[PDB]
mmCIF file of N, CA and C in Angstrom:
data_model
loop_
_atom_site.group_PDB
_atom_site.id
_atom_site.type_symbol
_atom_site.label_atom_id
_atom_site.label_comp_id
_atom_site.label_asym_id
_atom_site.label_seq_id
_atom_site.Cartn_x
_atom_site.Cartn_y
_atom_site.Cartn_z
ATOM 1 N N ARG A 1 0.850 -1.225 0.000
ATOM 2 C CA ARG A 1 0.000 0.000 0.000
ATOM 3 C C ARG A 1 0.868 1.251 0.000
ATOM 4 N N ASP A 2 0.786 1.996 1.095
ATOM 5 C CA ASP A 2 1.565 3.206 1.290
ATOM 6 C C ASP A 2 2.157 3.047 2.685
ATOM 7 N N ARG A 3 2.560 1.811 2.957
ATOM 8 C CA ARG A 3 3.146 1.410 4.225
ATOM 9 C C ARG A 3 4.540 2.008 4.376
ATOM 10 N N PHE A 4 5.309 1.976 3.294
ATOM 11 C CA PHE A 4 6.665 2.510 3.308
ATOM 12 C C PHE A 4 6.693 3.984 3.716
ATOM 13 N N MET A 5 5.814 4.788 3.120
ATOM 14 C CA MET A 5 5.763 6.218 3.416
ATOM 15 C C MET A 5 5.122 6.590 4.749
ATOM 16 N N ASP A 6 4.005 5.953 5.100
ATOM 17 C CA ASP A 6 3.355 6.276 6.370
ATOM 18 C C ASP A 6 4.288 5.941 7.523
ATOM 19 N N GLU A 7 5.141 4.951 7.288
ATOM 20 C CA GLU A 7 6.109 4.502 8.271
ATOM 21 C C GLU A 7 7.275 5.489 8.263
ATOM 22 N N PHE A 8 7.480 6.128 7.115
ATOM 23 C CA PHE A 8 8.546 7.106 6.957
ATOM 24 C C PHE A 8 8.219 8.371 7.737
ATOM 25 N N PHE A 9 6.973 8.836 7.648
ATOM 26 C CA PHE A 9 6.588 10.039 8.375
ATOM 27 C C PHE A 9 6.612 9.825 9.879
ATOM 28 N N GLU A 10 6.355 8.594 10.305
ATOM 29 C CA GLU A 10 6.404 8.277 11.724
ATOM 30 C C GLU A 10 7.868 8.317 12.157
ATOM 31 N N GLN A 11 8.771 7.971 11.240
ATOM 32 C CA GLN A 11 10.196 7.995 11.546
ATOM 33 C C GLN A 11 10.690 9.445 11.545
ATOM 34 N N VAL A 12 9.998 10.306 10.808
ATOM 35 C CA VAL A 12 10.357 11.717 10.758
ATOM 36 C C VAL A 12 10.017 12.357 12.099
ATOM 37 N N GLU A 13 8.847 12.023 12.640
ATOM 38 C CA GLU A 13 8.433 12.574 13.924
ATOM 39 C C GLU A 13 9.298 12.022 15.058
ATOM 40 N N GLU A 14 9.795 10.805 14.881
ATOM 41 C CA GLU A 14 10.671 10.200 15.882
ATOM 42 C C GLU A 14 11.986 10.981 15.945
ATOM 43 N N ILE A 15 12.556 11.251 14.775
ATOM 44 C CA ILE A 15 13.808 11.989 14.661
ATOM 45 C C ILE A 15 13.632 13.417 15.170
ATOM 46 N N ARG A 16 12.485 14.023 14.872
ATOM 47 C CA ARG A 16 12.212 15.379 15.331
ATOM 48 C C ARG A 16 12.193 15.408 16.866
ATOM 49 N N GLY A 17 11.588 14.385 17.459
ATOM 50 C CA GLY A 17 11.512 14.313 18.908
ATOM 51 C C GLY A 17 12.891 14.187 19.534
ATOM 52 N N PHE A 18 13.763 13.444 18.864
ATOM 53 C CA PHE A 18 15.130 13.247 19.337
ATOM 54 C C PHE A 18 15.883 14.564 19.260
ATOM 55 N N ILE A 19 15.748 15.250 18.130
ATOM 56 C CA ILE A 19 16.419 16.528 17.951
ATOM 57 C C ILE A 19 15.944 17.499 19.029
ATOM 58 N N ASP A 20 14.650 17.459 19.337
ATOM 59 C CA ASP A 20 14.070 18.323 20.364
ATOM 60 C C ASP A 20 14.599 17.949 21.753
ATOM 61 N N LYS A 21 14.898 16.671 21.958
ATOM 62 C CA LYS A 21 15.432 16.240 23.242
ATOM 63 C C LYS A 21 16.868 16.766 23.377
ATOM 64 N N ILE A 22 17.614 16.765 22.278
ATOM 65 C CA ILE A 22 18.984 17.268 22.288
ATOM 66 C C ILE A 22 18.928 18.761 22.628
ATOM 67 N N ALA A 23 18.052 19.487 21.941
ATOM 68 C CA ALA A 23 17.889 20.925 22.171
ATOM 69 C C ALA A 23 17.615 21.188 23.643
ATOM 70 N N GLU A 24 16.710 20.402 24.218
ATOM 71 C CA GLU A 24 16.361 20.544 25.627
ATOM 72 C C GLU A 24 17.566 20.253 26.536
ATOM 73 N N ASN A 25 18.365 19.238 26.198
ATOM 74 C CA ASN A 25 19.529 18.924 27.024
ATOM 75 C C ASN A 25 20.564 20.040 26.936
ATOM 76 N N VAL A 26 20.688 20.640 25.756
ATOM 77 C CA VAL A 26 21.656 21.716 25.548
ATOM 78 C C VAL A 26 21.338 22.913 26.452
ATOM 79 N N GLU A 27 20.055 23.224 26.610
ATOM 80 C CA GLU A 27 19.669 24.331 27.470
ATOM 81 C C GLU A 27 19.963 24.016 28.931
ATOM 82 N N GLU A 28 19.801 22.754 29.318
ATOM 83 C CA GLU A 28 20.064 22.355 30.698
ATOM 84 C C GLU A 28 21.570 22.419 30.939
ATOM 85 N N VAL A 29 22.360 22.066 29.926
ATOM 86 C CA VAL A 29 23.825 22.129 30.031
ATOM 87 C C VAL A 29 24.227 23.579 30.303
ATOM 88 N N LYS A 30 23.583 24.514 29.603
ATOM 89 C CA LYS A 30 23.874 25.929 29.805
ATOM 90 C C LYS A 30 23.558 26.327 31.243
ATOM 91 N N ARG A 31 22.472 25.785 31.799
ATOM 92 C CA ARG A 31 22.097 26.110 33.175
ATOM 93 C C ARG A 31 23.120 25.562 34.162
ATOM 94 N N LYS A 32 23.559 24.331 33.941
ATOM 95 C CA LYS A 32 24.553 23.725 34.827
ATOM 96 C C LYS A 32 25.878 24.483 34.732
ATOM 97 N N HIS A 33 26.251 24.894 33.523
ATOM 98 C CA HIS A 33 27.495 25.638 33.331
ATOM 99 C C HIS A 33 27.479 26.905 34.192
ATOM 100 N N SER A 34 26.377 27.644 34.116
ATOM 101 C CA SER A 34 26.243 28.880 34.874
ATOM 102 C C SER A 34 26.312 28.630 36.364
ATOM 103 N N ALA A 35 25.588 27.616 36.830
ATOM 104 C CA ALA A 35 25.575 27.285 38.253
ATOM 105 C C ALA A 35 26.964 26.934 38.760
ATOM 106 N N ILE A 36 27.703 26.160 37.971
ATOM 107 C CA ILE A 36 29.046 25.762 38.356
ATOM 108 C C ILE A 36 29.962 26.990 38.404
ATOM 109 N N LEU A 37 29.849 27.858 37.407
ATOM 110 C CA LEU A 37 30.682 29.053 37.370
ATOM 111 C C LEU A 37 30.333 30.074 38.460
ATOM 112 N N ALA A 38 29.071 30.125 38.859
ATOM 113 C CA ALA A 38 28.643 31.082 39.876
ATOM 114 C C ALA A 38 28.873 30.592 41.303
ATOM 115 N N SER A 39 29.284 29.341 41.449
ATOM 116 C CA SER A 39 29.497 28.767 42.771
ATOM 117 C C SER A 39 30.920 28.900 43.309
ATOM 118 N N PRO A 40 31.053 29.371 44.561
ATOM 119 C CA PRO A 40 32.354 29.544 45.215
ATOM 120 C C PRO A 40 33.052 28.191 45.357
ATOM 121 N N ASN A 41 32.259 27.165 45.651
ATOM 122 C CA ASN A 41 32.757 25.803 45.825
ATOM 123 C C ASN A 41 31.806 24.883 45.064
ATOM 124 N N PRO A 42 32.057 24.662 43.770
ATOM 125 C CA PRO A 42 31.176 23.788 42.985
ATOM 126 C C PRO A 42 30.882 22.399 43.575
ATOM 127 N N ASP A 43 29.654 21.942 43.352
ATOM 128 C CA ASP A 43 29.181 20.655 43.844
ATOM 129 C C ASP A 43 29.545 19.536 42.876
ATOM 130 N N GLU A 44 30.204 18.498 43.380
ATOM 131 C CA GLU A 44 30.576 17.364 42.544
ATOM 132 C C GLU A 44 29.371 16.690 41.890
ATOM 133 N N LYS A 45 28.247 16.653 42.600
ATOM 134 C CA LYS A 45 27.033 16.044 42.072
ATOM 135 C C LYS A 45 26.604 16.777 40.803
ATOM 136 N N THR A 46 26.712 18.102 40.835
ATOM 137 C CA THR A 46 26.339 18.922 39.688
ATOM 138 C C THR A 46 27.241 18.601 38.498
ATOM 139 N N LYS A 47 28.525 18.394 38.765
ATOM 140 C CA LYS A 47 29.454 18.066 37.700
ATOM 141 C C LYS A 47 29.114 16.700 37.130
ATOM 142 N N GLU A 48 28.686 15.790 38.000
ATOM 143 C CA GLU A 48 28.312 14.451 37.574
ATOM 144 C C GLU A 48 27.074 14.539 36.679
ATOM 145 N N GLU A 49 26.135 15.403 37.054
ATOM 146 C CA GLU A 49 24.907 15.569 36.279
ATOM 147 C C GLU A 49 25.222 16.171 34.921
ATOM 148 N N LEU A 50 26.200 17.069 34.895
ATOM 149 C CA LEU A 50 26.590 17.700 33.649
ATOM 150 C C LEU A 50 27.188 16.621 32.748
ATOM 151 N N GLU A 51 27.951 15.707 33.337
ATOM 152 C CA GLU A 51 28.554 14.634 32.553
ATOM 153 C C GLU A 51 27.521 13.706 31.929
ATOM 154 N N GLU A 52 26.481 13.382 32.687
ATOM 155 C CA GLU A 52 25.428 12.507 32.187
ATOM 156 C C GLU A 52 24.654 13.213 31.071
ATOM 157 N N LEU A 53 24.475 14.525 31.199
ATOM 158 C CA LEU A 53 23.774 15.286 30.167
ATOM 159 C C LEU A 53 24.559 15.235 28.867
ATOM 160 N N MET A 54 25.868 15.473 28.955
ATOM 161 C CA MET A 54 26.723 15.450 27.772
ATOM 162 C C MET A 54 26.694 14.067 27.132
ATOM 163 N N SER A 55 26.697 13.043 27.978
ATOM 164 C CA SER A 55 26.647 11.660 27.520
ATOM 165 C C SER A 55 25.325 11.413 26.791
ATOM 166 N N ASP A 56 24.238 11.885 27.384
ATOM 167 C CA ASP A 56 22.917 11.716 26.794
ATOM 168 C C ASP A 56 22.816 12.415 25.434
ATOM 169 N N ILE A 57 23.434 13.584 25.329
ATOM 170 C CA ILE A 57 23.431 14.328 24.080
ATOM 171 C C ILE A 57 24.170 13.556 22.998
ATOM 172 N N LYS A 58 25.379 13.114 23.324
ATOM 173 C CA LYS A 58 26.210 12.374 22.390
ATOM 174 C C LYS A 58 25.501 11.116 21.873
ATOM 175 N N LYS A 59 24.786 10.436 22.764
ATOM 176 C CA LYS A 59 24.066 9.215 22.424
ATOM 177 C C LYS A 59 22.870 9.470 21.503
ATOM 178 N N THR A 60 22.046 10.447 21.863
ATOM 179 C CA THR A 60 20.870 10.780 21.068
ATOM 180 C C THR A 60 21.265 11.329 19.700
ATOM 181 N N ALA A 61 22.392 12.031 19.643
ATOM 182 C CA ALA A 61 22.878 12.587 18.388
ATOM 183 C C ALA A 61 23.290 11.469 17.444
ATOM 184 N N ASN A 62 23.943 10.433 17.976
ATOM 185 C CA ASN A 62 24.361 9.319 17.129
ATOM 186 C C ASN A 62 23.114 8.641 16.567
ATOM 187 N N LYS A 63 22.047 8.599 17.362
ATOM 188 C CA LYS A 63 20.799 7.997 16.902
ATOM 189 C C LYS A 63 20.259 8.806 15.725
ATOM 190 N N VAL A 64 20.300 10.128 15.851
ATOM 191 C CA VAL A 64 19.817 10.998 14.786
ATOM 192 C C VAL A 64 20.682 10.836 13.553
ATOM 193 N N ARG A 65 21.999 10.938 13.738
ATOM 194 C CA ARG A 65 22.941 10.796 12.631
ATOM 195 C C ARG A 65 22.743 9.474 11.916
ATOM 196 N N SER A 66 22.592 8.412 12.699
ATOM 197 C CA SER A 66 22.407 7.076 12.146
ATOM 198 C C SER A 66 21.107 6.945 11.350
ATOM 199 N N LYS A 67 20.010 7.452 11.898
ATOM 200 C CA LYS A 67 18.738 7.358 11.194
ATOM 201 C C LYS A 67 18.734 8.210 9.926
ATOM 202 N N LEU A 68 19.355 9.383 9.984
ATOM 203 C CA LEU A 68 19.406 10.249 8.811
ATOM 204 C C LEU A 68 20.285 9.657 7.711
ATOM 205 N N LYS A 69 21.362 8.982 8.102
ATOM 206 C CA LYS A 69 22.259 8.380 7.112
ATOM 207 C C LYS A 69 21.509 7.253 6.421
ATOM 208 N N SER A 70 20.740 6.517 7.210
ATOM 209 C CA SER A 70 19.954 5.407 6.695
ATOM 210 C C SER A 70 18.936 5.902 5.657
ATOM 211 N N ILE A 71 18.282 7.016 5.965
ATOM 212 C CA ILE A 71 17.297 7.591 5.060
ATOM 213 C C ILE A 71 17.985 8.038 3.777
ATOM 214 N N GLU A 72 19.159 8.645 3.915
ATOM 215 C CA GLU A 72 19.896 9.111 2.748
ATOM 216 C C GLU A 72 20.346 7.937 1.876
ATOM 217 N N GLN A 73 20.844 6.871 2.498
ATOM 218 C CA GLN A 73 21.291 5.708 1.737
ATOM 219 C C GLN A 73 20.128 5.153 0.933
ATOM 220 N N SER A 74 18.943 5.174 1.528
ATOM 221 C CA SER A 74 17.750 4.677 0.861
ATOM 222 C C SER A 74 17.408 5.552 -0.342
ATOM 223 N N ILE A 75 17.521 6.864 -0.155
ATOM 224 C CA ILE A 75 17.253 7.824 -1.222
ATOM 225 C C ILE A 75 18.216 7.598 -2.389
ATOM 226 N N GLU A 76 19.501 7.444 -2.082
ATOM 227 C CA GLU A 76 20.488 7.236 -3.125
ATOM 228 C C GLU A 76 20.278 5.912 -3.855
ATOM 229 N N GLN A 77 19.872 4.883 -3.120
ATOM 230 C CA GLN A 77 19.638 3.586 -3.740
ATOM 231 C C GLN A 77 18.549 3.746 -4.785
ATOM 232 N N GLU A 78 17.547 4.539 -4.436
ATOM 233 C CA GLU A 78 16.430 4.804 -5.321
ATOM 234 C C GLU A 78 16.907 5.577 -6.551
ATOM 235 N N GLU A 79 17.800 6.536 -6.336
ATOM 236 C CA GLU A 79 18.317 7.346 -7.429
ATOM 237 C C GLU A 79 19.175 6.529 -8.388
ATOM 238 N N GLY A 80 19.751 5.436 -7.898
ATOM 239 C CA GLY A 80 20.559 4.585 -8.754
ATOM 240 C C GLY A 80 19.708 4.061 -9.897
ATOM 241 N N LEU A 81 18.398 4.277 -9.793
ATOM 242 C CA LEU A 81 17.449 3.844 -10.811
ATOM 243 C C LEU A 81 17.364 4.864 -11.939
ATOM 244 N N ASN A 82 18.039 5.996 -11.751
ATOM 245 C CA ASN A 82 18.057 7.054 -12.754
ATOM 246 C C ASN A 82 16.631 7.554 -12.981
ATOM 247 N N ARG A 83 15.799 7.458 -11.947
ATOM 248 C CA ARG A 83 14.407 7.891 -12.044
ATOM 249 C C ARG A 83 13.917 8.562 -10.762
ATOM 250 N N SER A 84 12.987 9.506 -10.907
ATOM 251 C CA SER A 84 12.431 10.236 -9.767
ATOM 252 C C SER A 84 10.943 9.940 -9.566
ATOM 253 N N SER A 85 10.432 10.298 -8.386
ATOM 254 C CA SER A 85 9.029 10.089 -8.027
ATOM 255 C C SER A 85 8.643 11.051 -6.901
ATOM 256 N N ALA A 86 7.342 11.229 -6.690
ATOM 257 C CA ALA A 86 6.861 12.132 -5.656
ATOM 258 C C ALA A 86 7.349 11.720 -4.265
ATOM 259 N N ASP A 87 7.354 10.419 -3.986
ATOM 260 C CA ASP A 87 7.809 9.951 -2.682
ATOM 261 C C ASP A 87 9.299 10.205 -2.484
ATOM 262 N N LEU A 88 10.091 9.958 -3.522
ATOM 263 C CA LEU A 88 11.526 10.186 -3.434
ATOM 264 C C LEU A 88 11.772 11.651 -3.091
ATOM 265 N N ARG A 89 11.042 12.544 -3.748
ATOM 266 C CA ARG A 89 11.216 13.961 -3.487
ATOM 267 C C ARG A 89 10.733 14.363 -2.097
ATOM 268 N N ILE A 90 9.673 13.719 -1.614
ATOM 269 C CA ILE A 90 9.159 14.014 -0.278
ATOM 270 C C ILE A 90 10.223 13.588 0.740
ATOM 271 N N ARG A 91 10.800 12.408 0.534
ATOM 272 C CA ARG A 91 11.831 11.923 1.438
ATOM 273 C C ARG A 91 13.073 12.811 1.392
ATOM 274 N N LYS A 92 13.441 13.285 0.205
ATOM 275 C CA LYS A 92 14.616 14.146 0.090
ATOM 276 C C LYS A 92 14.380 15.458 0.843
ATOM 277 N N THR A 93 13.144 15.952 0.819
ATOM 278 C CA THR A 93 12.829 17.195 1.510
ATOM 279 C C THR A 93 12.863 17.039 3.034
ATOM 280 N N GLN A 94 12.292 15.953 3.542
ATOM 281 C CA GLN A 94 12.273 15.741 4.987
ATOM 282 C C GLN A 94 13.683 15.494 5.520
ATOM 283 N N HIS A 95 14.527 14.865 4.709
ATOM 284 C CA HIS A 95 15.894 14.590 5.130
ATOM 285 C C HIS A 95 16.702 15.880 5.233
ATOM 286 N N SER A 96 16.526 16.782 4.273
ATOM 287 C CA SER A 96 17.260 18.034 4.316
ATOM 288 C C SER A 96 16.726 18.937 5.429
ATOM 289 N N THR A 97 15.431 18.838 5.723
ATOM 290 C CA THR A 97 14.826 19.652 6.775
ATOM 291 C C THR A 97 15.289 19.157 8.146
ATOM 292 N N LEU A 98 15.175 17.854 8.379
ATOM 293 C CA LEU A 98 15.616 17.278 9.641
ATOM 294 C C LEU A 98 17.117 17.546 9.822
ATOM 295 N N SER A 99 17.883 17.442 8.738
ATOM 296 C CA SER A 99 19.330 17.682 8.801
ATOM 297 C C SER A 99 19.630 19.111 9.230
ATOM 298 N N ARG A 100 18.879 20.054 8.679
ATOM 299 C CA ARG A 100 19.063 21.464 9.012
ATOM 300 C C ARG A 100 18.852 21.652 10.509
ATOM 301 N N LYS A 101 17.732 21.143 11.016
ATOM 302 C CA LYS A 101 17.422 21.258 12.436
ATOM 303 C C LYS A 101 18.495 20.600 13.311
ATOM 304 N N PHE A 102 18.997 19.450 12.865
ATOM 305 C CA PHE A 102 20.013 18.721 13.617
ATOM 306 C C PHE A 102 21.331 19.497 13.638
ATOM 307 N N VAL A 103 21.734 20.010 12.483
ATOM 308 C CA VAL A 103 22.961 20.791 12.416
ATOM 309 C C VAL A 103 22.846 22.045 13.294
ATOM 310 N N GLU A 104 21.679 22.679 13.311
ATOM 311 C CA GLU A 104 21.517 23.883 14.127
ATOM 312 C C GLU A 104 21.723 23.588 15.610
ATOM 313 N N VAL A 105 21.084 22.532 16.105
ATOM 314 C CA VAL A 105 21.205 22.191 17.524
ATOM 315 C C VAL A 105 22.629 21.787 17.912
ATOM 316 N N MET A 106 23.274 20.946 17.102
ATOM 317 C CA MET A 106 24.634 20.527 17.419
ATOM 318 C C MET A 106 25.628 21.691 17.334
ATOM 319 N N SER A 107 25.374 22.649 16.443
ATOM 320 C CA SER A 107 26.258 23.807 16.312
ATOM 321 C C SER A 107 26.144 24.678 17.554
ATOM 322 N N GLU A 108 24.928 24.791 18.072
ATOM 323 C CA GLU A 108 24.675 25.577 19.270
ATOM 324 C C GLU A 108 25.361 24.903 20.459
ATOM 325 N N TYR A 109 25.320 23.572 20.492
ATOM 326 C CA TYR A 109 25.943 22.811 21.569
ATOM 327 C C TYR A 109 27.470 22.964 21.529
ATOM 328 N N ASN A 110 28.059 22.863 20.337
ATOM 329 C CA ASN A 110 29.504 23.010 20.196
ATOM 330 C C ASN A 110 29.956 24.400 20.641
ATOM 331 N N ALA A 111 29.164 25.417 20.311
ATOM 332 C CA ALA A 111 29.488 26.790 20.695
ATOM 333 C C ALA A 111 29.347 26.982 22.213
ATOM 334 N N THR A 112 28.368 26.312 22.808
ATOM 335 C CA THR A 112 28.166 26.405 24.251
ATOM 336 C C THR A 112 29.348 25.743 24.966
ATOM 337 N N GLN A 113 29.800 24.598 24.449
ATOM 338 C CA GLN A 113 30.931 23.884 25.051
ATOM 339 C C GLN A 113 32.238 24.665 24.918
ATOM 340 N N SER A 114 32.460 25.242 23.742
ATOM 341 C CA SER A 114 33.674 26.012 23.505
ATOM 342 C C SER A 114 33.718 27.203 24.445
ATOM 343 N N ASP A 115 32.568 27.845 24.611
ATOM 344 C CA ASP A 115 32.463 29.010 25.475
ATOM 345 C C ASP A 115 32.718 28.660 26.937
ATOM 346 N N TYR A 116 32.183 27.527 27.372
ATOM 347 C CA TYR A 116 32.377 27.091 28.745
ATOM 348 C C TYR A 116 33.856 26.761 28.983
ATOM 349 N N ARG A 117 34.461 25.996 28.072
ATOM 350 C CA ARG A 117 35.866 25.634 28.213
ATOM 351 C C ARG A 117 36.720 26.890 28.317
ATOM 352 N N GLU A 118 36.336 27.919 27.576
ATOM 353 C CA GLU A 118 37.078 29.170 27.606
ATOM 354 C C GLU A 118 36.970 29.826 28.981
ATOM 355 N N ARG A 119 35.775 29.803 29.557
ATOM 356 C CA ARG A 119 35.559 30.397 30.872
ATOM 357 C C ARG A 119 36.202 29.618 32.013
ATOM 358 N N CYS A 120 36.258 28.300 31.881
ATOM 359 C CA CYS A 120 36.873 27.466 32.902
ATOM 360 C C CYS A 120 38.379 27.651 32.866
ATOM 361 N N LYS A 121 38.923 27.855 31.670
ATOM 362 C CA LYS A 121 40.348 28.043 31.513
ATOM 363 C C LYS A 121 40.694 29.397 32.024
ATOM 364 N N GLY A 122 40.004 30.416 31.522
ATOM 365 C CA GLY A 122 40.305 31.765 31.929
ATOM 366 C C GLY A 122 40.172 31.903 33.436
ATOM 367 N N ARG A 123 39.869 30.781 34.093
ATOM 368 C CA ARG A 123 39.669 30.784 35.537
ATOM 369 C C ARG A 123 40.598 30.381 36.671
ATOM 370 N N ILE A 124 40.041 30.662 37.848
ATOM 371 C CA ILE A 124 40.538 30.474 39.214
ATOM 372 C C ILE A 124 41.874 31.126 39.548
#
């Protein structure tokens, strides 16, 4: 039927949710960074929580990267047919859109980490 595509859109919403979870973790990382920097004697528990957040981000990102690569490989396999279709184009659009959102969140995270490392170094 249209099982392949209806299942594809469900996979799109899954990836979107993951990207949104990364975004949410990135904001919490920013909060922990501030708390650690504003504290006269930082709490080890807080540092541990920051570590788990970073770990969670890295893990969810690999899931996103992996699912997006899979979608792209599928698109290219289809293109090896030297032919196009409405579904192929729909999939190509969702892949570039999800990719854009993913790149934006990871870029924000990398900038947040670089900034924190700079402040920790410039410190004590």
